[PDB]
């Protein structure tokens, strides 16, 4: 009921890194404090590392196990955006703002970081556990994918959106907004594929899959809180970032056809500013009664 519509929306959102000139960001970057520059670098590396997993494994593995030519095509398109567009865009932002040696060090740090690794490996673990012709394991991986696309990225997206909403780092913020817009539709689409599997299950199996999804969400959420304090306490933003995580967790759940887990909260206004029946001929004698 939905793949051709998503095909259309995906292909009409096509874009390339070269379209946004990045150099003018240096005019606001130079005015940020060390903690602001440090947080931005770390957040950016976090997003980059997670998105690479999605391009190399997450999207291609789901495309492999999903049946249907049109679904495979949409999924291929999404994988292309991760690898050919998003990955180049993140690299471009980095190369503009930091010298080569600084980029290498930030990636070394974020690669060793406990909270980034915990979530990255949890997601990758579920992708590696998909078994041929087993729709339960596929569903679990789709849940992981939706959580990445619609939830885990947002502790990171917060900061570029926060600057973007203030008139700072506008070129890279525009790029991030385009990336985020792609991840939103990716999350919704994979969510619909997961609901299709979920709806084929018994009531007991459904309850079991719901428990899986909520348990996974809880593990990721508790790690996100730690990840958040680790990055954002030094710039005083953690309270507001936490509200943004919960709001996006609720969107991820709704993508999977589940009820919101967290109470509704208002979001930081600066970040908001950044954001056919069968045709049968009449046979005559149908006019007589």
């Amino acid at each position: 009921d939905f793949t051709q519509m998503f095909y259309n929306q995906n292909v009409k959102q096509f874009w390339l890194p070269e379209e946004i000139a990045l150099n003018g960001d240096l005019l606001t970057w130079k005015y940020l404090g060390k903690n602001e520059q440090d947080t931005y670098m770390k957040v950016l590396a976090g997003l980059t590392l997670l998105d690479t997993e999605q391009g190399n494994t997450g999207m291609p593995i789901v495309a492999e196990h999903v049946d249907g030519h049109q679904r495979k095509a949409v999924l291929n398109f999404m994988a292309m955006m991760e690898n050919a567009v998003h990955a180049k865009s993140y690299s471009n932002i980095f190369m503009t703002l930091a010298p080569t040696e600084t980029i290498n060090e930030v990636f070394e740090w974020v690669k060793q970081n406990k909270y980034l690794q915990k979530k990255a490996q949890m997601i990758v673990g579920l992708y590696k556990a998909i078994q041929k012709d087993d729709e339960i394991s596929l569903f679990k991986a789709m849940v992981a994918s939706v959580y990445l696309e619609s939830f885990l990225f947002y502790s990171g997206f917060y900061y570029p959106l926060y600057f973007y909403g203030q008139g700072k780092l506008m070129q890279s913020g525009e790029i991030i907004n385009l990336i985020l817009r792609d991840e939103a539709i990716h999350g919704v689409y994979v969510g619909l594929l997961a609901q299709e599997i979920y709806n084929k299950q018994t009531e007991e199996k459904k309850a079991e899959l719901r428990e899986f999804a909520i348990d996974l969400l809880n593990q990721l959420y508790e790690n996100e809180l730690e990840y958040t304090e680790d990055l954002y306490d030094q710039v005083g933003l953690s309270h507001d970032v936490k509200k943004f995580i919960r709001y996006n967790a609720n969107k991820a759940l709704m993508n999977l056809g589940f009820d919101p887990y967290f109470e509704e909260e208002d979001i930081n206004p600066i970040v908001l500013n950044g954001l056919k029946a069968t045709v049968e001929p009449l046979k005559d004698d149908d006019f007589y009664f």
Partner: protein
């Protein structure tokens, strides 16, 4: 999640293999002991409440000033003496979310059900305390329900208009088209659904003063009206809803239909304007005989004959149109057009189907005008005269644009109280009051037609609820017998009340003398045929009530001949969408779509069982989609024989059936005398 929400969801949790319907009742209690009573605003006495609502621009002070405060207190005490309780959670929820008056910030509830009913009754009575008490007893017993505009807006300062539907005739001119757009925006601003007859507009490729192939046809006017309804959307609260009606013999009829095709281009597709097709008997005859038909260019016909194509009878003028070389026409396949109609209705539920000859063979006011189109719900079928809106600084010739006030009888409550006569007469009086106090300053034809026609619409709800709660299958002949008798009684007492109002006011509706009411023709089938129940069960159902016989109908005919009728039109059965929830009634005379409906509100989900649904009457509450549409057509025709206007007849189709089945249902409806078909909802 709220406690009442959990209690309402407990219905579907089966206990011993049966639904927990009684849990629903518990929910209402919770909904009142945890939300409504806490969110209600209480005053020391009624005086402080009325003063607060008057000075804070919640209530109009004029209608309350006609009563002394003692009389208003007595009316409110009469309303509260019934101790009315909502039997289902959804009834109270719908009232307190859609109809109960709230504060400016919508944080508290100022109006209870009794308060709203008392205010509506005081507005209806217009200074009569006893009449106000009668209205209070009629509405608190839920025998009669004023329409959503009237019930929601009566006596309110920030109110809109009490009229639900408006029907506009659009003449073939740029001035008339612009005036129609303006009036549509004005009436959508007032909150009413606007229907426009586009059959007089000349088709695409016609001449505007000797330059040919110049007109955009009805599709350009359709786009203009669609944008007008999008702009005027009740201040952004309810999406602006419009209807366009086109005769099936219009040349643009295909393009018209192409506005609703799911593959239509953006320059043609229209999405906020419902479409209706008016089918004369000539088109059905041509399709039946498989003879190729001809659609016509209205402007050529108007030039040749001096009258519009829809202004005269196609059954007698179609051959003259075809044989006239000065009339321009295009060849079509009527069977292919019927199949296109069926396919469009399967895909999107459009167009509305209006069988023009079925409407006009029993239309009582053909002398004023033939019924050429219907309303947005395809149940209003009244005479309309097109207006000649001329240039600026020139006097306009104001015609008649249809507008009627809606009100529904609750069949279960009316028959339980054995008060068909009293309820019908009081509802007729209330609708007459609503018409009298309606004055629209931006629709001149609507105002003139309201003042002259004095047309009202008295509908009915809870037909299927009454039948299922009394052990009668909706498709059974006993149900059709009950509908025949009940609606003959309703028509009899509506005609009696109209004649009594005409006698007491000394005035009839305009051009009543040429109507079939004045000549006595309307009463023919009523003075020769007996409509008493043919089944003993139905007769027992009607016990304690005097069923009018042919002698009573003869006396009523003589009374009408002596005194006339105040209302040109009295009965029209509207869909009654959301106000049926408050009355704990099934929607209109249609069969129920589902026994228990799951509706999502906010982040919660609620289940509304049909009123009176239980184990013993589970199979009597047969779902409409599972029913034979031919027997539903039989029921609707049986009701329609006693209704002067139309009935919003929604077709309930299964996905398995083809467009041929839909065409067969449409042709059987036309054969059985069905005036209009509302929707083709597919399960």
């Amino acid at each position: 999640v709220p406690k009442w929400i959990q209690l309402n969801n407990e219905i579907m949790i089966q206990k011993d293999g049966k639904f927990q319907f009684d849990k629903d009742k518990e929910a209402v209690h919770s909904y009142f002991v945890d939300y409504i009573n806490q969110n209600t605003v209480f005053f020391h006495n009624l005086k402080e409440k009325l003063d607060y609502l008057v000075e804070n621009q919640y209530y109009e002070e004029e209608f309350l000033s006609l009563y002394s405060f003692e009389d208003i207190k007595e009316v409110f005490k009469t309303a509260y003496a019934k101790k009315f309780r909502f039997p289902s959670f959804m009834s109270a929820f719908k009232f307190y979310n859609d109809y109960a008056l709230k504060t400016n910030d919508k944080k508290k509830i100022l109006e209870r059900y009794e308060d709203r009913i008392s205010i509506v009754a005081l507005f209806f009575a217009n200074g009569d305390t006893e009449k106000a008490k009668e209205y209070v007893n009629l509405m608190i017993n839920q025998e009669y329900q004023p329409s959503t505009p009237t019930f929601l807006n009566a006596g309110r300062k920030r109110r809109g208009e009490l009229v639900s539907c408006f029907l506009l005739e659009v003449n073939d001119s740029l001035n008339d088209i612009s005036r129609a757009i303006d009036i549509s925006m004005q009436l959508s601003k007032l909150g009413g659904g606007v229907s426009l007859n586009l059959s007089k507009l000349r088709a695409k490729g016609e001449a505007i003063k000797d330059v040919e192939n110049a007109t955009k046809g009805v599709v350009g006017v359709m786009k203009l009206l669609d944008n007008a309804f999008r702009y005027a959307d009740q201040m952004g609260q309810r999406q602006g809803s419009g209807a366009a009606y086109l005769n099936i013999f219009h040349r643009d009829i295909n393009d018209f239909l192409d506005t609703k095709k799911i593959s239509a281009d953006e320059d043609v597709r229209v999405k906020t304007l419902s479409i209706g097709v008016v089918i004369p008997d000539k088109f059905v005859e041509l399709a039946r005989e498989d003879k190729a038909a001809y659609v016509f260019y209205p402007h050529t016909i108007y030039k040749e004959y001096g009258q519009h194509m829809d202004e005269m009878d196609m059954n007698e003028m179609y051959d003259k149109f075809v044989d006239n070389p000065r009339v321009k026409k295009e060849k079509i396949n009527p069977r292919k057009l019927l199949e296109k109609l069926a396919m469009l209705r399967s895909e999107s539920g459009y167009p509305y189907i209006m069988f023009q000859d079925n409407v006009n063979k029993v239309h009582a006011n053909n002398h004023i005008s033939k019924v050429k189109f219907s309303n947005l719900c395809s149940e209003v079928l009244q005479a309309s005269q097109v207006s000649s809106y001329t240039d600026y600084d020139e006097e306009d010739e104001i015609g008649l644009d249809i507008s009627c006030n809606l009100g529904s009888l609750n069949i279960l409550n009316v028959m339980e109280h054995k008060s068909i006569e009293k309820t019908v007469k009081l509802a007729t009086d209330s609708l007459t009051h609503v018409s009298e106090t309606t004055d629209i300053r931006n629709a001149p034809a609507v105002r003139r037609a309201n003042k002259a026609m004095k047309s009202i619409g008295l509908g009915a709800m809870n037909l299927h609820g009454y039948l299922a709660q009394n052990g009668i299958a909706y498709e059974s002949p006993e149900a059709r017998d009950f509908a025949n008798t009940f609606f003959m009684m309703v028509n009899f007492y509506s005609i009696q009340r109209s004649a009594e109002i005409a006698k007491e006011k000394g005035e009839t509706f305009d051009q009543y003398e040429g109507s079939t009411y004045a000549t006595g023709e309307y009463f023919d089938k009523y003075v020769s045929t007996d409509f008493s129940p043919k089944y003993e069960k139905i007769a027992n159902l009607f016990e304690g009530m005097h069923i009018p016989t042919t002698e009573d109908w003869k006396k009523l005919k003589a009374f009408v001949a002596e005194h006339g009728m105040y209302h040109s039109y009295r009965l029209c059965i509207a869909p009654t969408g959301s106000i049926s929830y408050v009355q704990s009634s099934t929607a209109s005379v249609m069969p129920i779509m589902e026994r228990i409906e799951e509706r999502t509100y906010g982040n919660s989900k609620t289940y509304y069982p049909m009123p009176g649904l239980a184990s013993n009457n589970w199979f009597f509450y047969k779902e409409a989609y599972d029913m034979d549409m031919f027997k539903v057509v039989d029921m609707i025709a049986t009701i329609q024989q006693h209704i002067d206007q139309g009935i919003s007849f929604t077709l309930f189709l299964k996905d398995t059936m083809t467009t041929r089945d839909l065409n067969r249902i449409d042709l059987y409806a036309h054969h059985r005398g069905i005036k209009t078909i509302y929707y083709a909802r597919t399960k």
